[PDB]
Amino acid sequence: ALTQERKNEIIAEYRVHDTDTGSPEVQIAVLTAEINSLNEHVRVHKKDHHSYRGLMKMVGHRRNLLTYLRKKDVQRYRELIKRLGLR
Amino acid sequence: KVCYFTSNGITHIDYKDVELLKKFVSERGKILPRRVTGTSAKYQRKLTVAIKRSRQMALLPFVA
Amino acid sequence: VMTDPIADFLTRIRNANMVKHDKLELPASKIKKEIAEILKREGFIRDVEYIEDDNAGTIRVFLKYGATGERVITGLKRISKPGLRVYAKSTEVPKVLNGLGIAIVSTSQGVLTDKEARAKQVGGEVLAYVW
Amino acid sequence: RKYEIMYIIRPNIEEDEKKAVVERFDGILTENGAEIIESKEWGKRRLAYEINDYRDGFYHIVKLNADKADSINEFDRLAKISDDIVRHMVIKE
RNA sequence: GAAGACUGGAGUGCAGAAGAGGAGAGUGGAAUUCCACGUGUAGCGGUGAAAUGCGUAGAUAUGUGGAGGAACACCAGUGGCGAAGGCGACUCUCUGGUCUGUAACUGACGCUGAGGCGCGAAAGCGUGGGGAGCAAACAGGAUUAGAUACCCUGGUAGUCCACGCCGUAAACGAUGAGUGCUAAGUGUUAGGGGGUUUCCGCCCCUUAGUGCUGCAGCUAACGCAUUAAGCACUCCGCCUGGGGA
Numbered sequence: 001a002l003t004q005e006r007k008n009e010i011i012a013e014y015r016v017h018d019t020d021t022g023s024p025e026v027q028i029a030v031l032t033a034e035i036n037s038l039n040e041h042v043r044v045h046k047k048d049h050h051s052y053r054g055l056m057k058m059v060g061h062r063r064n065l066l067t068y069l070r071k072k073d074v075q076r077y078r079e080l081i082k083r084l085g086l087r
Numbered sequence: 088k089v090c091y092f093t094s095n096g097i098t099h100i101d102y103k104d105v106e107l108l109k110k111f112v113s114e115r116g117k118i119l120p121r122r123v124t125g126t127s128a129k130y131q132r133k134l135t136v137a138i139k140r141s142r143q144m145a146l147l148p149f150v151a
Numbered sequence: 152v153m154t155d156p157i158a159d160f161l162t163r164i165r166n167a168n169m170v171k172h173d174k175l176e177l178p179a180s181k182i183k184k185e186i187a188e189i190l191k192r193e194g195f196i197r198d199v200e201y202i203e204d205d206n207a208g209t210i211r212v213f214l215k216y217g218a219t220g221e222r223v224i225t226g227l228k229r230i231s232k233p234g235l236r237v238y239a240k241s242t243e244v245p246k247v248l249n250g251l252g253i254a255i256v257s258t259s260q261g262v263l264t265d266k267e268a269r270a271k272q273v274g275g276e277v278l279a280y281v282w
Numbered sequence: 283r284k285y286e287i288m289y290i291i292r293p294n295i296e297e298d299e300k301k302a303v304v305e306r307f308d309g310i311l312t313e314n315g316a317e318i319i320e321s322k323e324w325g326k327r328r329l330a331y332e333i334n335d336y337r338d339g340f341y342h343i344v345k346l347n348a349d350k351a352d353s354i355n356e357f358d359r360l361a362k363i364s365d366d367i368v369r370h371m372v373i374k375e
Numbered sequence: 376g377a378a379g380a381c382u383g384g385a386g387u388g389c390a391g392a393a394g395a396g397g398a399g400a401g402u403g404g405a406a407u408u409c410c411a412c413g414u415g416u417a418g419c420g421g422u423g424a425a426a427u428g429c430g431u432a433g434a435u436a437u438g439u440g441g442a443g444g445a446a447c448a449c450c451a452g453u454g455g456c457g458a459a460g461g462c463g464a465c466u467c468u469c470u471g472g473u474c475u476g477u478a479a480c481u482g483a484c485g486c487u488g489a490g491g492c493g494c495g496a497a498a499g500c501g502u503g504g505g506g507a508g509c510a511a512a513c514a515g516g517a518u519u520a521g522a523u524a525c526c527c528u529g530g531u532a533g534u535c536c537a538c539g540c541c542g543u544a545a546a547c548g549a550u551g552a553g554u555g556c557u558a559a560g561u562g563u564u565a566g567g568g569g570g571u572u573u574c575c576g577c578c579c580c581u582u583a584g585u586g587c588u589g590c591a592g593c594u595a596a597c598g599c600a601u602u603a604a605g606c607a608c609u610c611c612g613c614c615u616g617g618g619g620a
């Protein structure tokens with residue numbers, strides 16, 4: 001997991017306004033950070049399958065959120081995707 | 088019967104306290120069943136953890 | 152409910168009858184209110200009331216029984232489910248129990264009973280059979 | 283994150299070298315960014331069983347507030363390799 | 376279909392809780408086996424009975440010391456966790472899921488899912504290690520009309536660890552997943568609220584699991600019955616007499 005602070009800087013950095021916590025711009029950023037953190041654990045611990053399932057579930061959830069954001073409002077999607085360096 | 092730590096509000100069963108743990112082990116060091124001790128399951132788990140942790144440090148005998 | 156709320160309404164009424172309940176409350180909707188009004192005006196229930204709340208509102212219905220039970224309403228079924236929707240022409244509107252029961256049809260002038268849909272010579276999606 | 287280390291020093295030891303081996307491990311924890319909060323000795327006790335040919339020991343307790351988790355590892359290694367400690371245990375809390 | 380709006384479905388934030396969930400490293404005590412050394416001496420072991428077998432080249436027994444492997448007594452409980460397989464000694468590092476409480480945030484962002492991709496008990500295969508117990512194949516002794524078996528004395532592959540294959544089972548709740556509705560009574564696990572009491576404590580309410588007994592309802596019957604096999608909606612998989620197969 002990401003330490004509470006490490007999560008909070010990401011939340012504060014990707015806020016669309018002063019008080020949000022659940023907007024897609026925040027959830028996608030946090031999920032990207034978490035799966036990146038899990039990438040190297042999977043790389044070094046290659047026989048941990050019960051955590052690979054969690055990684056796959058996170059990837060699927062983040063993809064669904066990205067699809068929703070793209071459909072609803074394209075400009076936000078194309079700004080955020082460039083900010084996070086996705087694709 | 089009534090639980091011990093629940094009555095005395097003891098929220099922590101430390102493994103540095105041999106005299107308290109002497110009550111819950113029989114004449115041979117075997118942990119007494121919860122039915123005889125009369126403690127709650129939640130505190131029984133902590134108690135068993137503490138008994139094993141104390142046994143590891145030669146504070147209590149494995150077999151007496 | 153998740154997929155089809157009208158079927159949920161019908162099955163709630165059916166479940167309430169089986170154990171001889173007296174009233175039932177459920178979430179409200181613009182079509183459920185009108186179905187309840189048709190049921191009351193036709194004579195299959197006793198009363199309907201609307202209770203207001205924050206999000207959407209609630210509707211309660213008081214069911215009707217004879218002097219010694221004898222369920223006034225003895226059967227409900229849904230015809231046009233989300234997986235298959237059925238439409239009826241003006242000359243194809245079904246007759247339930249030789250007119251003893253009623254069929255609800257959502258025509259171009261609101262939802263109508265089977266009888267009054269044959270007065271305006273209009274048809275549409277059949278929702279439910281009640282008898 | 284806080285910690286707690288217990289270890290037993292052999293009985294047949296003299297006060298000077300006993301203090302030397304007491305303070306060597308305190309120093310080895312301080313070699314890394316680990317703040318010691320306590321170093322009190324918990325005293326002579328009689329072992330419930332003979333872990334070695336021995337029957338008694340100096341029980342010693344240390345409190346730490348470390349984060350990097352390397353000080354405890356180095357203590358573990360250089361206390362396992364030494365023959366002036368018979369048994370030790372690190373606990374996280 | 377399009378343009379808006381909302382929060383009850385879904386998710387995040389904040390405060391708590393429990394757990395044999397998984398991967399890596401280190402450590403512990405009982406017990407079997409073997410080896411060395413004192414005491415001793417005539418048997419030990421084994422079965423329905425007996426024998427094969429071990430022992431005067433001195434065992435079995437008994438006391439001390441040493442070596443190595445595998446599994447973790449008591450706790451332990453229709454208890455817990457995980458999607459399934461499955462997970463039980465202790466400590467540290469890296470990690471996934473779940474529940475309760477709050478109403479702060481987004482505002483339908485959801486369900487199912489052919490083909491695809493991953494996991495998948497045990498036996499089994501390839502390379503390199505390890506081998507204390509156990510034990511397919513095998514040898515001897517017994518029983519039997521016969522005994523390629525049950526029983527007894529031994530015993531190799533394997534059971535263990537590293538990497539890569541295999542992809543099966545009575546892989547079972549013989550019961551696909553999601554949602555809503557429909558009498559009660561009583562145990563247990565993890566939480567929240569309240570009344571009383573000086574606190575422990577007694578009682579009620581409530582959320583999420585796990586057991587039992589039973590009304591309506593269902594079934595050919597046995598039985599299921601708020602953890603449905605009852606009443607309904609969405610999506611998927613499968614069946615159409617037996618043998619051949």
Ligand SMILES: [Mg+2]
Nearest residue numbers: 383384385386
């Ligand atoms: Mg919610």
Ligand SMILES: [Mg+2]
Nearest residue numbers: 394395396456
């Ligand atoms: Mg745990």
Ligand SMILES: [Mg+2]
Nearest residue numbers: 395396397462
């Ligand atoms: Mg674990």
Ligand SMILES: [Mg+2]
Nearest residue numbers: 404405406407
């Ligand atoms: Mg031993």
Ligand SMILES: [Mg+2]
Nearest residue numbers: 434435436437
């Ligand atoms: Mg001997």
Ligand SMILES: [Mg+2]
Nearest residue numbers: 456457458473
């Ligand atoms: Mg589960």
Ligand SMILES: [Mg+2]
Nearest residue numbers: 381480481482
């Ligand atoms: Mg708003």
Ligand SMILES: [Mg+2]
Nearest residue numbers: 486487488552
């Ligand atoms: Mg699904």
Ligand SMILES: [Mg+2]
Nearest residue numbers: 488489490491
């Ligand atoms: Mg498939």
Ligand SMILES: [Mg+2]
Nearest residue numbers: 497498499534
């Ligand atoms: Mg195997």
Ligand SMILES: [Mg+2]
Nearest residue numbers: 499500501533
């Ligand atoms: Mg092999």
Ligand SMILES: [Mg+2]
Nearest residue numbers: 514515516523
């Ligand atoms: Mg033979």
Ligand SMILES: [Mg+2]
Nearest residue numbers: 509510529530
């Ligand atoms: Mg054998």
Ligand SMILES: [Mg+2]
Nearest residue numbers: 542543544546
């Ligand atoms: Mg099969």
Ligand SMILES: [Mg+2]
Nearest residue numbers: 542543544546
């Ligand atoms: Mg087959």
Ligand SMILES: [Mg+2]
Nearest residue numbers: 460496546547
């Ligand atoms: Mg099974």
